[PDB]
Design a protein around this ligand. Sequence first.
Ligand code: HEM
Length: 184
Amino acid sequence: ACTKNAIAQTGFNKDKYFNGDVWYVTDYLDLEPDDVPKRYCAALAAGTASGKLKEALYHYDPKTQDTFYDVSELQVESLGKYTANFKKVDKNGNVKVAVTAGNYYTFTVMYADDSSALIHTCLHKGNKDLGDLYAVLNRNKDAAAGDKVKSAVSAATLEFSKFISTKENNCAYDNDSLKSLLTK
Ligand code: HEM
């Protein structure tokens, strides 16, 4: 179960965040015990496509090889805070699991600049939530976390030392598929 009302960044710049480009997860923190694997990778694209606010997600377990993509339309709750009902798709946007009530995530942009971001998500999927999940993002998949985003982690009353890095998993991303999925 999720327990945090994450606060969106003051002055959040939606058009810069949702510019159609890719964000890589470099570090993550799940508040719940062994909610997610210790070794993981993930990335997303975020943009407006034909007037609609969209995200495309990619998940890959580097040990089991489990791979999936998602597309969602984001609804606005407030500046930087969204509710997303997702559909599981292949990399080409063909639907594998349709949108359904009960399958949604919330998404809060706590900090962002042109290169880095801190987000919170709460996943709801039928019978399961995946507890509060924080993610440090970068435009460069290999970037070490800089002072702006590390300071934002501190300002959220979190300890960056507890975040788990994704960097040592050899993950490789299809950033072309992520961008194209925004339209699907
Ligand atoms: C970057 C932000 C992230 C968002 C918005 C997000 C969102 C989601 C969504 C919507 C699903 C369900 C997809 C489907 O069934 O079609 C999912 C599943 C999952 N995510 Fe994330 N995720 C993100 C990052 C992560 C990270 C960094 C981990 C870390 C380990 C992670 C681990 C998982 C796991 C293991 C599942 C499978 C859950 C299951 O079905 O039991 N996610 N995520």
